[PDB]
Amino acid sequence: QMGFSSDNPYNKRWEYKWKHSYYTYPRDYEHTEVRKPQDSKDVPPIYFAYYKDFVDRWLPGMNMWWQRRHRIFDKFNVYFLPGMSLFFYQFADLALGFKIMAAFPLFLAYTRIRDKTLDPDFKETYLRDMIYQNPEITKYFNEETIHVLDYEFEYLPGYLCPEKFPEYQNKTWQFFNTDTAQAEGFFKFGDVESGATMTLKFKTMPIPGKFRYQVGEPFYFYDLRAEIKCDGVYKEVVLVDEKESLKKIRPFLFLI
Amino acid sequence: LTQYVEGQIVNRNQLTLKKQEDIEQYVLKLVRGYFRTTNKQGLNINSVLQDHGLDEFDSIELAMQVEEDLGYVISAETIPVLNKVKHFVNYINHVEQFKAENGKAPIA
Amino acid sequence: ATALYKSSALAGNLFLYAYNYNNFTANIRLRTMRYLFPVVSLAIFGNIYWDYRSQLVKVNLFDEYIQARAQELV
Amino acid sequence: ILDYLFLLDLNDDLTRKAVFEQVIIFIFIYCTMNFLAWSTVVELIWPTHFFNRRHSSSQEFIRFRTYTEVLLKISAYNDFFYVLNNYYYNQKLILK
Amino acid sequence: GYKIRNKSIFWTRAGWKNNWHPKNFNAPRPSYGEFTMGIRCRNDHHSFLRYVQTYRNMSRHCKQYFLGDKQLEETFILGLRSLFLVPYDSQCLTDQIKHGGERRFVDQLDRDFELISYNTHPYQLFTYTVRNEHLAWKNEQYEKIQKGEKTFEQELLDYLDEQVLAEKAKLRDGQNFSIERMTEIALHVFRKARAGKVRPAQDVRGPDGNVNDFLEQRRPFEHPNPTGVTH
Ligand SMILES: CCCCCCCCCCCCCCCCCC(=O)OC[C@H](COP(=O)([O-])OCC(O)COP(=O)([O-])OC[C@@H](COC(=O)CCCCCCCCCCCCCCCCC)OC(=O)CCCCCCCCCCCCCCCCC)OC(=O)CCCCCCCCCCCCCCCCC
Numbered sequence: 169q170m171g172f173s174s175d176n177p178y179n180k181r182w183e184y185k186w187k188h189s190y191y192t193y194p195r196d197y198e199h200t201e202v203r204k205p206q207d208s209k210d211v212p213p214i215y216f217a218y219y220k221d222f223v224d225r226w227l228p229g230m231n232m233w234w235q236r237r238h239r240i241f242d243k244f245n246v247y248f249l250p251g252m253s254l255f256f257y258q259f260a261d262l263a264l265g266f267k268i269m270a271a272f273p274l275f276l277a278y279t280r281i282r283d284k285t286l287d288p289d290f291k292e293t294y295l296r297d298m299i300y301q302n303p304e305i306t307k308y309f310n311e312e313t314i315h316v317l318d319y320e321f322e323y324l325p326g327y328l329c330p331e332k333f334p335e336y337q338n339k340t341w342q343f344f345n346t347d348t349a350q351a352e353g354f355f356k357f358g359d360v361e362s363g364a365t366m367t368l369k370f371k372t373m374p375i376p377g378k379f380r381y382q383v384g385e386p387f388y389f390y391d392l393r394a395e396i397k398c399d400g401v402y403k404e405v406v407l408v409d410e411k412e413s414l415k416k417i418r419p420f421l422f423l424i
Numbered sequence: 425l426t427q428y429v430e431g432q433i434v435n436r437n438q439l440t441l442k443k444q445e446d447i448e449q450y451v452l453k454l455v456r457g458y459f460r461t462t463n464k465q466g467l468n469i470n471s472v473l474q475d476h477g478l479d480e481f482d483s484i485e486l487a488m489q490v491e492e493d494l495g496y497v498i499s500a501e502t503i504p505v506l507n508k509v510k511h512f513v514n515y516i517n518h519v520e521q522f523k524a525e526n527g528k529a530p531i532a
Numbered sequence: 533a534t535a536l537y538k539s540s541a542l543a544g545n546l547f548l549y550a551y552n553y554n555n556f557t558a559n560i561r562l563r564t565m566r567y568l569f570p571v572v573s574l575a576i577f578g579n580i581y582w583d584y585r586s587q588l589v590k591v592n593l594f595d596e597y598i599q600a601r602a603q604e605l606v
Numbered sequence: 607i608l609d610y611l612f613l614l615d616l617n618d619d620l621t622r623k624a625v626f627e628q629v630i631i632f633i634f635i636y637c638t639m640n641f642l643a644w645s646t647v648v649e650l651i652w653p654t655h656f657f658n659r660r661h662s663s664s665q666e667f668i669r670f671r672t673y674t675e676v677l678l679k680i681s682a683y684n685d686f687f688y689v690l691n692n693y694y695y696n697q698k699l700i701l702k
Numbered sequence: 703g704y705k706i707r708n709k710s711i712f713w714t715r716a717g718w719k720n721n722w723h724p725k726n727f728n729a730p731r732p733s734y735g736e737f738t739m740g741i742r743c744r745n746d747h748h749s750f751l752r753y754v755q756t757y758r759n760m761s762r763h764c765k766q767y768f769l770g771d772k773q774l775e776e777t778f779i780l781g782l783r784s785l786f787l788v789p790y791d792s793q794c795l796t797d798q799i800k801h802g803g804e805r806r807f808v809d810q811l812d813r814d815f816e817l818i819s820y821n822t823h824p825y826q827l828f829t830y831t832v833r834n835e836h837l838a839w840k841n842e843q844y845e846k847i848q849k850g851e852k853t854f855e856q857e858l859l860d861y862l863d864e865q866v867l868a869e870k871a872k873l874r875d876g877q878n879f880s881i882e883r884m885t886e887i888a889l890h891v892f893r894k895a896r897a898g899k900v901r902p903a904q905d906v907r908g909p910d911g912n913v914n915d916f917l918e919q920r921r922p923f924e925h926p927n928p929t930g931v932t933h
């Protein structure tokens with residue numbers, strides 16, 4: 169689900185990605201039809217530029233943190249960092265080093281809250297390169313004739329089944345994370361040339377690559393399935409199966 | 425739901441096709457109504473808009489008109505692939521099927 | 533004289549905004565003036581009236597003391 | 607009623623800092639200076655715009671019509687222009 | 703009349719007539735993954751779709767004030783396309799611009815749209831003024847036609863059709879009534895009609911046919927020179 173959403177009707181999956189060059193915000197939201205001069209309000213009210221920045225930039229930003237508040241309720245952010253801040257805050261008047269060591273854990277929490285509340289963005293260019301290499305998909309779909317009908321991609325809440333992914337039954341990892349960092353979603357596609365539609369379901373998880381401490385790909389498609397539907401033909405393509413992928417690579421278990 | 429037409433306020437009417445034959449006729453009537461279209465009678469279901477004096481910017485004006493007549497909210501990611509009459513017919517069907525199965529409009 | 537001049541100069545700014553109302557109101561390049569012109573106008577009015585009000589209080593304190601202290605000395 | 611409104615005082619400003627009375631003098635000068643400089647920069651784009659739009663065209667390239675040149679040709683033509691077009695059409699396209 | 707004589711007028715340190723990548727010291731250099739830790743860049747691949755939506759917005763938001771005038775909507779489109787086609791038809795190699803011409807033009811069009819959303823763009827106010835002056839002249843013709851009266855434009859067309867007949871009835875040696883000849887006849891009438899507006903035709907003399915108008919004149923008592931002294 170898209171966390172950052174304003175009252176704008178167009179391009180919901182790009183609202184947080186697009187960086188406009190406007191000095192301020194437009195008077196009205198993007199029109200879905202031709203309106204009349206009296207439908208809109210000339211010379212908008214005083215303090216309108218500030219009101220827009222609050223309802224178009226601030227408010228949808230706070231709705232993102234509220235929508236994904238379940239990913240920051242870990243014992244490290246809830247108890248450790250606030251407690252560390254209070255221990256040095258009692259000595260803030262003795263020296264400056266206490267003021268610093270009391271505010272650092274708060275800036276650290278905001279950074280984890282900041283990165284954890286963002287909409288999960290996979291490398292979509294890697295994905296389209298993967299499906300356009302399959303012959304069963306290029307038979308009905310092409311980039312010059314494909315269009316998106318729906319898009320959903322959100323993290324999975326809580327820990328998963330402790331038999332398929334025993335990695336997350338680690339009390340040290342659980343101390344920093346309350347979620348799994350995995351995401352699940354789908355892609356509703358259509359081809360205007362062949363008239364075909366397909367639902368591209370996918371599951372992602374972070375994996376390590378080529379290095380010891382750093383993550384290789386935070387969103388690695390370990391399950392990728394396509395249910396293609398045409399005029400009178402229904403096909404089911406399996407680009408990535410989880411039974412064969414989970415035997416080669418395991419999740420990463422982010423810390424901090 | 426009202427719009428100005430030559431200085432007069434007129435109530436706008438929306439259409440519901442829900443039929444293949446009604447779509448092919450609407451798109452042709454739509455493309456033939458655009459002042460940039462050439463060879464309006466030579467236009468058929470398999471006509472490339474490039475062959476009738478239309479470019480990428482003209483497909484936008486056509487899509488903008490589809491939103492006016494049908495009430496759809498077409499995203500910017502879908503417009504640049506509408507380069508043939510066949511494309512508008514299949515896209516309109518995909519939208520009618522999406523609302524009939526998912527009970528909601530496609531992502532804008 | 534100072535309060536009357538500073539009041540006329542403040543009124544002059546109101547004319548400048550009225551004489552150029554269409555630009556300050558409709559042109560977004562002048563939005564900051566539309567939004568903050570009255571805040572500056574109030575802060576200017578406050579200084580004008582503050583000084584007049586304070587001066588008025590002191591004059592009245594001075595007048596009531598010389599009258600009271602004089603009768604004691606009589 | 608709060609004590610924050612005491613900042614409006616200037617009769618007794620010499621009791622705290624006596625600085626406001628001299629700083630604004632610079633601010634007025636700084637504004638005057640930027641007014642002369644910025645007005646000179648943003649105003650003096652017109653000589654370049656006037657010369658290029660009247661002397662920059664060449665025969666080995668195509669001059670493309672602008673928005674204003676479209677509205678003027680189609681929605682700002684005079685009577686003589688309307689007469690000349692219809693005059694050419696009737697003589698050649700109709701009367702040969 | 704006058705041509706630039708300097709042969710090196712279009713020379714730049716980046717080449718001839720190069721206005722896409724001027725030569726600067728801090729030139730773009732490549733980046734290598736194995737050796738790159740972090741990077742801060744604003745470039746993305748969203749300029750294409752932003753180029754599409756920007757058109758849809760500038761068009762739909764401008765039509766709010768056209769009042770359903772179909773001839774104006776089509777005219778505005780032609781003008782709007784001339785603004786979006788600048789990168790595709792310019793001599794400047796927009797594909798070789800310093801840091802991405804795609805992002806540059808899109809960010810520029812976004813500043814125009816912001817003003818359009820407020821109906822403060824000089825193209826909008828110029829279109830309204832131009833159109834109102836056009837309709838006032840078209841309505842004057844309509845009011846004169848409903849009364850059966852003849853328009854000043856039709857009187858010229860009829861006066862030019864008969865002059866062509868008079869000039870071609872004597873052009874028997876040749877029979878090529880060129881477009882050049884048709885033109886100079888019309889221009890001669892235009893010059894006389896143009897001067898007639900300021901000095902109308904009182905008598906058989908015709909438009910601007912009185913010498914007395916060019917004798918010494920004086921400002922009227924009720925309208926003297928307001929801007930300067932007279933003596
Ligand atoms: C050598 C001897 C030295 C003598 C010293 C004196 C030198 C001369 C001083 C001249 C400047 C002062 C002007 C005095 C009036 C003179 C008459 C005149 O204007 O000339 C003929 C003038 C025509 O000018 P023109 O030269 O023939 O041709 C002009 C062109 O056509 C083009 O048309 P246009 O309209 O665009 O032209 C505008 C024209 C004329 O513009 C006008 O409309 C004139 C009106 C100017 C008003 C001045 C502000 C006063 C505000 C109202 C105060 C009211 C107090 C009482 C309230 C009682 C009710 C509660 O020029 C001006 O705008 C003059 C402005 C002068 C600069 C003011 C800058 C102020 C900031 C600096 C402050 C410095 C401290 C001193 C400030 C003192 C303020 C009291 O006549 C008219 O304009 C008729 C106006 C009819 C309708 C008026 C309706 C009332 C408008 C009031 C505005 C309200 C503002 C918002 C409320 C503010 C109050 C809170």
Ligand SMILES: CCCCCCCCCCCCCCCCCC(=O)OC[C@H](COP(=O)([O-])OCC[N+](C)(C)C)OC(=O)CCCCCCCCCCCCCCCCC
Pocket residue numbers: 183184185186187188225226229230233
């Ligand atoms: C006991 C008192 C509690 C402590 C008070 C804390 C006050 C916090 C608010 C003031 C600080 C503002 C600093 C902002 C600096 C950065 C600008 C910015 O906001 O970016 C937003 C950005 C906006 O997005 P962006 O700027 O990152 O990118 C936008 C991308 N485009 C342009 C494409 C759209 O979003 C965020 O940063 C995340 C949301 C942070 C929310 C900020 C705190 C909100 C607090 C809400 C609760 C307050 C309760 C009090 C109210 C009581 C009733 C009156």
Ligand SMILES: CCCCCCCCCCCCCCCCCC(=O)OC[C@H](COP(=O)([O-])OCC[N+](C)(C)C)OC(=O)CCCCCCCCCCCCCCCCC
Pocket residue numbers: 240241245246250271274275277278282
């Ligand atoms: C009484 C005094 C002490 C008050 C408390 C401590 C105050 C700390 C200093 C406040 C400074 C305010 C004025 C400056 C405004 C900031 C300027 C700025 O650049 O910020 C932009 C930043 C932008 O950050 P950004 O990361 O999104 O983008 C910036 C990226 N770079 C750096 C590359 C440019 O946005 C902020 O305002 C963040 C400031 C966060 C500070 C808030 C501390 C509290 C943390 C939240 C509460 C957590 C509690 C625990 C929760 C547990 C789980 C629920």
Ligand SMILES: Nc1ncnc2c1ncn2[C@@H]1O[C@H](COP(=O)(O)OP(=O)(O)OP(=O)(O)O)[C@@H](O)[C@H]1O
Pocket residue numbers: 185289290291292293294733741742743744745746
């Ligand atoms: N090779 C690069 N060189 C310089 N800057 C880059 C590079 N790649 C990314 N950046 C910056 O990092 C940002 C994020 O990159 P990212 O690939 O996640 O964007 P994206 O829109 O999610 O791509 P995709 O659609 O394939 O998922 C980019 O917007 C860019 O500013």
Ligand SMILES: [Mg+2]
Pocket residue numbers: 289290291292
């Ligand atoms: Mg992505």
